[PDB]
Amino acid sequence: EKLGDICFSLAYVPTAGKLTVVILAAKNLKKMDVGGLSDPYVKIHLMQNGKRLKKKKTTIKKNTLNPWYNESFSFEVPFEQIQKVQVVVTVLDYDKIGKNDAIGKVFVGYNSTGAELRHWSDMLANPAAPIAQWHTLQVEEEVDAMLA
Numbered sequence: 001e002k003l004g005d006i007c008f009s010l011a012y013v014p015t016a017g018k019l020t021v022v023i024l025a026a027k028n029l030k031k032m033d034v035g036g037l038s039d040p041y042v043k044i045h046l047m048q049n050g051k052r053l054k055k056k057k058t059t060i061k062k063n064t065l066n067p068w069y070n071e072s073f074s075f076e077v078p079f080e081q082i083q084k085v086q087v088v089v090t091v092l093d094y095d096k097i098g099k100n101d102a103i104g105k106v107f108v109g110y111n112s113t114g115a116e117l118r119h120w121s122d123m124l125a126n127p128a129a130p131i132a133q134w135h136t137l138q139v140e141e142e143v144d145a146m147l148a
Helices: 079-084 112-127 140-147
Strands: 003-014 018-027 040-048 051-055 068-076 085-093 101-109 131-136
Touching: 003 085, 003 112, 018 085, 018 131, 040 068, 051 068, 079 085, 085 140, 101 112, 101 140, 112 131, 112 140
Parallel strands: none
Antiparallel strands: 003 018, 003 131, 018 068, 040 051, 040 085, 085 101
């Protein structure tokens, strides 16, 4: 089933070790609520060798399957470690009095493939520039097995 798509930009400044992720938007998200929509927010994790180094999250948008965020996050990653980390992006539904269930997730960086690997490589090909791309969300369990 189609889970939706996430747009984000990546920028990396190797001399400063500064990685900036901008969560731009999502589109066509799986609906998660009785009212036919979702209340989506996005989590970013910086991972290295299966350990969480840093966690960030966006604000929560209400009643929408097509949120616009334009929210920026900064990470410190030394240049000698840049090909060892993963940036994992998860879209979840917020339910204040229930559970927050994941809609789907993707990751870029170490062991990534296809357009995710190309997005990461294009970040490194264009130092300090914010390269944006749309990515298809994948089933949470399946991505978790790739990250393990």
